Swiss-Prot record:
The gene is DCLRE1A. This is DNA cross-link repair 1A protein. It comes from Homo sapiens (Human). Binds constitutively to TP53BP1. Binds CDC27, which is itself a component of the anaphase promoting complex (APC). Binds PIAS1. Expressed in brain, heart, kidney, liver, pancreas, placenta and skeletal muscle. It is found in: Nucleus. Disulfide bonds: none annotated. Changing D139N: Impaired nuclear focus formation, reduced interaction with PIAS and increased sensitivity to cisplatin. Induction: During mitosis. The mRNA encoding this protein contains an internal ribosome entry site (IRES) in its 5'-UTR. This 5'-UTR generally suppresses translation while specifically promoting expression during mitosis, when cap-dependent translation may be impaired. The lineage of its organism: Eukaryota, Metazoa, Chordata, Craniata, Vertebrata. May be required for DNA interstrand cross-link repair. Also required for checkpoint mediated cell cycle arrest in early prophase in response to mitotic spindle poisons. Possesses beta-lactamase activity, catalyzing the hydrolysis of penicillin G and nitrocefin. Exhibits no activity towards other beta-lactam antibiotic classes including cephalosporins (cefotaxime) and carbapenems (imipenem). Belongs to the DNA repair metallo-beta-lactamase (DRMBL) family.
Amino acid sequence: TCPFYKKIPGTGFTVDAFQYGVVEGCTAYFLTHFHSDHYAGLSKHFTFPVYCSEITGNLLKNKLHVQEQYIHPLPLDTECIVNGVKVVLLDANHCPGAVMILFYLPNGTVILHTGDFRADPSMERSLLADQKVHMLYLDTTYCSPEYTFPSQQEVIRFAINTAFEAVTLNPHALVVCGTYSIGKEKVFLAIADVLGSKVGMSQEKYKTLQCLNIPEINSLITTDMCSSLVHLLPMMQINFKGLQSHLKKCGGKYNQILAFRPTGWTHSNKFTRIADVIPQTKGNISIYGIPYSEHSSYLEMKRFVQWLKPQKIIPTVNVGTWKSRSTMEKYFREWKLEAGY
Ligand code: NI
């Protein structure tokens, strides 16, 4: 049944709760972002109000065929009224269109639901600074101290330098980037920019990117694979068999692949720096795993929560095992004792 951490007390609301059928008492279904574990269950047959960002609303209409009369897009950073309750959507620094939701309950309680987010100090100057939050529904994906990773800026610098060097040494190399959902567009767009190429992709992915309000996107992406030297493929296909196969398909226009797999975390991060990453190579194919994360590191998450000082924390990730839950609750107590709230 619908878990408690998907329900907003004192309202008829749920968050990211589309795979349970009709949730009893739910008058408004919010969707934080367009990732399949969160939207799972939506289709053209859904007839309840869905509240989301403009970008998420474009993807619901164009990719899932949800009928327009049930899509309620809200602007960001704007106080809005939903079934009598004041709400605000905030940028979550996750994938395009991803939001955090602030609920102002009639009784005076203020609730923040982070959806999926990558905490950042810029958040400390949004509408969040203006009032107290009593309950925080927190994206705890990486809530353990082993999870460190570099800034997004450092990772894109490594990728741009690597690609530029490879293609300048060999003008017949192809760059390939893996994807399985929206998010991490900076990876392939930054590489294409430094090489003076558009990114080539399938018609289905091109359609997806045209939903995102990314400025000048017509200038950066294309469905013509041949004219392009940065290709996007399903993440599944980013391996030696998949890549040897793809290389056949270009008809000897290319003699070398350099491929990027933007993973979240992998255990080379506890040891290795970004400057010290190496690929896996077979023949004329090299694969680089780069730690480009759209979720908070442990230290980013800890800073955000010690700034906000919530009265109660409700984890939304890693909640399925007793040892995970108990470990997270021990970190929350450390944070509160160190900070004095
Ligand atoms: Ni997500």
